[PDB]
């Protein structure tokens, strides 16, 4: 399994996404955080802070 850290995603049953390690310490077994904004995932929006993660490309403004 894998956790999708974000405020609303769209990923569902297909389109291989990159996966990386990291336990959540919140769900027994969930030990891998999803790669957001990568291979087949569109990363979250509404965010600019710490956008290096969550795949949020640079704000124009």
């Amino acid at each position: 399994t894998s956790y999708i850290g974000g405020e609303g995603h769209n990923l569902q049953e297909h389109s291989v996404i990159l996966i990386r390690g990291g336990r959540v310490k919140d769900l027994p077994g969930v030990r891998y955080h999803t790669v957001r904004g990568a291979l087949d995932c569109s990363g979250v929006k509404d965010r600019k802070q710490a956008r290096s993660k969550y795949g949020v490309k640079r704000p124009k403004a």
């Binding site: 569902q12 049953e13 297909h14 389109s15 291989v16």
Partner: protein, 272 residues
């Protein structure tokens, strides 16, 4: 896996061919242009990549709505049986709102005179229904048009808990739902068609076969701008059954209008 991308390779190479996703049914769309366009794609996949797929047919949404009133039917729940019980009484009135202006399907307000439901629970009891509405019982597909007026209720000091109010509400809804005897709605698509001049008598006659109705049409240079309301269900691969008539001279556009009545025989294809 290897399949979906295998088409994306050929979904960029042919700018007329597209590949959507059946969000509401989690599947895929081959967006071609005719018998041949669809054919070779299958075989181009078939041998060039040695990956077999089965042609199918699109899906629909099938959302529901009630057609009558409900009186007050309750939903009280008390899972006490020792410990911290789950208590909550919900007696409500759900109604057939119009499919009109207002955006979302249902509608909810309170009607508890004495505040007999204390504060916090309302949004709480509600959320389960806010959740409940992602799918309807009548089919297993979402619903719209809930004119719910919360009549009354009743609880317990330190036992009546939100879990109960999310829970107890649902039961009130199920019973309430059966007392308003709803029915399915299917996607009705606004569709226009251009017809030479002469095969119009066949295109108009065609829509009658497909349940559509005569709702405006005007003539032009070498065509006519036809309009009808037809459910998307009766639109599988229109062009084939279309071109075959007008020497393939017609040109149509499909824009969604609004859901509407699903008839008797249509209502039970819901079978599963």
């Amino acid at each position: 896996e290897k399949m979906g991308l295998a088409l994306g390779r050929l979904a960029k190479e042919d700018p007329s061919f597209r590949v959507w996703t059946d969000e509401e049914s989690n599947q895929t769309i081959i967006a071609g242009m005719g018998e041949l366009h669809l054919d070779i794609i299958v075989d181009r996949m078939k041998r060039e990549f040695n990956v077999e797929a089965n042609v199918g047919k699109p899906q629909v949404a099938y959302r529901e709505t009630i057609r009558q009133k409900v009186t007050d039917v309750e939903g009280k729940h008390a899972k006490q049986s020792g410990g911290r019980g789950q208590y909550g009484h919900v007696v409500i009135d759900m109604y057939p709102l119009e499919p009109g202006s207002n955006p979302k399907g249902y509608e909810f307000i309170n009607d508890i005179k004495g505040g007999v439901i204390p504060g916090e629970y309302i949004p709480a009891v509600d959320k389960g229904i806010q959740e409940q509405l992602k799918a309807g019982p009548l089919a297993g597909y979402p619903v719209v048009d809930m004119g719910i007026r919360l009549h009354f209720g009743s609880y317990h000091d330190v036992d009546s808990s939100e879990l109960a109010f999310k829970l107890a509400a649902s039961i009130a809804f199920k019973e309430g739902f059966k007392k308003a005897k709803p029915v399915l709605l299917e996607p009705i698509m606004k569709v226009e068609v251009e017809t030479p001049e002469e095969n119009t008598g066949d295109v108009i006659g065609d829509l009658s076969r497909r349940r559509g109705m005569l709702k405006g049409q005007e003539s032009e240079v070498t065509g006519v701008k036809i309009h009808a309301e037809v459910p998307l269900s009766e639109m599988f691969g229109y062009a084939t059954q279309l071109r075959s008539l007008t020497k393939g001279r017609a040109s149509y556009t499909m824009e969604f209008l609004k859901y509407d009545e699903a008839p008797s025989n249509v209502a039970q294809a819901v079978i599963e």
